[PDB]
Amino acid sequence: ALTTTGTEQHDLFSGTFWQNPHPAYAALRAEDPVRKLALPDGPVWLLTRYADVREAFVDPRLSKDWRHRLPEDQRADMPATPTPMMILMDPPDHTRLRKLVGRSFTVRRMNELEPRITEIADGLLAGLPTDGPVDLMREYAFQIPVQVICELLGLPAEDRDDFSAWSSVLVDDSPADDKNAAMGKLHGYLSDLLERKRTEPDDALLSSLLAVSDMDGDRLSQEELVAMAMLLLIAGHETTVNLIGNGVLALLTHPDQRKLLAEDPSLISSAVEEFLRFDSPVSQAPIRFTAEDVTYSGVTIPAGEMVMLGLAAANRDADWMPEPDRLDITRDASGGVFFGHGIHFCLGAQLARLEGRVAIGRLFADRPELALAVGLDELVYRRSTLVRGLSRMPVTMGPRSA
Ligand code: HEM
Ligand SMILES: C=C1CC[C@H](O)C/C1=C\C=C1/CCC[C@]2(C)[C@@H]([C@H](C)CCCC(C)C)CC[C@@H]12
Ligand SMILES: [Ca+2]
Ligand SMILES: [Ca+2]
Ligand SMILES: [Ca+2]
């Protein structure tokens, strides 16, 4: 299996890496900042230094067009995308689709979700037991973003178990065939759902976008519409959940920071920016492809290569953040690559921040005696090149505050 080269040998994407990748990231940054990883499905490069990562995000030679893997002899007949989502596109199609959906994620709109997000969180908290076993992932961290995305999009509650299962397969280490099947089932479900919405619209986002598509199919094609729905659904199941889990865990393992939050609950938004930096939920950005040779930190990646931008790694770069391994919820936050950078910058950044401060803030306010029910070393993490996320989090809630 893979290990870091140089003075320190740490497992990479196997072994100890899943439990705590942060030492490996640091050894990469120090001694191998532009690393080719010989992974089972083919080699993938990894950039870990903050200055390289942030600039790479605005470097058009690092493209989302997967046809760059192919010799020119082979690109003509090939679709731009495995599924026409904007996160898999370059301009101009990316520009058009982002501009369109961005109109529904205005600052005013996301904030008026706060009362509802708070009811959802409060309802979940009221439903949790005082001392029997609780998996805080499945029972709280997962539930908030999923209910919110279902409500925002207009996804039937009764189908949640079906599409959450498809979503999870797509973001972890599942075989390529399993992912292809999951994507197929998700495409079909959402296509059938949109057909029903035509007949009976609602006021939620998928109906609104179906109407846009119906009125102007060059602005949004039917297939682009399904891919958009799929993207928003997956983002609603697999990101914010791990801000909540990782942020909760950070407070559970850092009594000093938990105390500062208890003493000034208004630190929560600064705290959320710090959780995003300290244990980034999207550990590596989804893959980019070199359209031509690129050079970062003295190392040239040839054209036709797959490249991950190491967000969890860059966000602990001491060249950017002093004392990057210290959790300090009081930092006046700026920069950061946890939501990406440039044209693909997280569409849901305001929504994730809101869900995060509500979920984490109300949790610690309601259950100020919350604690882990296992040792730190017994926590099991998901195997994913995309997310840093707990599989389960055994906790004891303790009594409700008075
Ligand atoms: C803490 C939670 C979240 C994190 C850490 C996160 C992270 C990211 C990152 C790093 C990117 C850029 C990927 C790249 O450039 O390759 C991105 C893009 C994106 N995110 Fe978020 N995300 C979160 C929550 C959400 C939510 C709640 C939504 C729901 C709307 C969402 C929707 C999207 C979409 C649609 C894109 C593609 C944007 C584009 O291509 O123009 N994300 N996200
Ligand atoms: C089966 C296949 C077929 C071959 C593709 O190349 C890989 C694949 C699925 C992976 C995909 C396509 C669907 C959307 C995914 C899962 C993206 C996903 C929505 C990322 C979440 C973005 C997050 C940072 C907000 C990233 C990788 C994408
Ligand atoms: Ca209960
Ligand atoms: Ca209407
Ligand atoms: Ca510096």
Curated annotation (Swiss-Prot):
Q: Which UniProt keywords apply?
A: Cytoplasm, Heme, Iron, Metal-binding, Monooxygenase, Oxidoreductase
- Pfam families per the UniProt record, alphabetical: p450
Principal localization reads cytoplasm
The protein's matches in CDD domains, at most eight in alphabetical order, are given as: CYP107-like
What the entry lists under InterPro entries is as follows: Cyt_P450, Cyt_P450_B, Cyt_P450_CS, Cyt_P450_sf
| Enzyme's top EC category | oxidoreductase
Q: How is its activity regulated?
A: Activated by partially methylated beta-cyclodextrin.
Q: Where does heme bind?
A: 346
**Known catalysed reaction(s)?**
5beta-cholestane-3alpha,7alpha,12alpha-triol + 6 reduced [adrenodoxin] + 3 O2 + 5 H(+) = (25R)-3alpha,7alpha,12alpha-trihydroxy-5beta-cholestan-26-oate + 6 oxidized [adrenodoxin] + 4 H2O
Subcellular localization, per the record? Cytoplasm
Protein's UniProt keywords contain Glycosyltransferase: no
Q: Which domain of life is it from?
A: Bacteria
> What does this protein need as cofactor?
heme
* A GO molecular-function descriptor: cholestanetetraol 26-dehydrogenase activity
Q: What is its EC number?
A: 1.14.15.15
Single GO cellular component annotation?
A: cytoplasm
Give the record's family classification: Belongs to the cytochrome P450 family.
What is the purpose of this protein?
Hydroxylates vitamin D(3) into 25-hydroxyvitamin D(3) and 1-alpha,25-dihydroxyvitamin D(3), its physiologically active forms. Also displays 25-hydroxylase activity on vitamin D(2) and 7-dehydrocholesterol. May play a role in the biosynthesis of steroid metabolic intermediates.
Specify the protein name. Answer: Vitamin D(3) 25-hydroxylase
